[PDB]
Ligand binder design. Sequence first.
Ligand SMILES: O=C(N[C@@H]1c2ccccc2-c2c(-c3nc4ccncc4[nH]3)cccc21)c1ccnc2[nH]ccc12
Length: 207
Amino acid sequence: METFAFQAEIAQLMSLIINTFYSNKEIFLRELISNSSDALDKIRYESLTDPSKLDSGKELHINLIPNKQDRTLTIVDTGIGMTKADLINNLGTIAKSGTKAFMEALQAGADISMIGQFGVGFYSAYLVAEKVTVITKHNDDEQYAWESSAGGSFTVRTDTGEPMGRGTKVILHLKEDQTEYLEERRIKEIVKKHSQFIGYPITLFVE
Ligand SMILES: O=C(N[C@@H]1c2ccccc2-c2c(-c3nc4ccncc4[nH]3)cccc21)c1ccnc2[nH]ccc12
């Protein structure tokens, strides 16, 4: 397991998300489902020129998996996934420019719910999670696990878990006071409100 330091910009954004008082937290699901949808679009478009791109799995879907025992909400997609380079360097670049843009928009009057317009909606996960674990598999790399509980650092290591084929799993280790997002009625309510038109089947698992 390797440990990396977040750059100043993104670290500050993560702290604002965790410290700022904001009641409309439910938007985190909309943002994560949107990112899954985008990743699914990417692998699908690539498969149009190179069909073998789907040898690692032809199904294009999104699964929402709540687990009360572990107090986690997992979003799983069979999208393009992320390579090690994406996890450590590429997305670090996007996180910096996106954070800078978003922070300047906030001082103007932009709301936290507009975070997705700046390419850093992923971080809205910290509105409800104390820790986020990302398990991902890209065709050009091996399966990796990225993880961070804020505090200025994150980790990356090869994942020895169940082989995914291709895609991304975003595991949200929910804060003690945010367990409503593990309730079937609550999740269904949110999906219908913000993601009813996503072009991929969204299956809400139950327990
Ligand atoms: O939302 C997605 N991805 C995010 C992301 C988005 C924007 C900026 C950084 C990061 C990041 C980082 C990340 N943030 C950093 C900040 C600084 N340095 C390295 C960094 N890596 C680490 C893991 C995951 C992610 C995503 C991509 C493809 N399909 C997906 N399906 C479901 C999510 C998903």
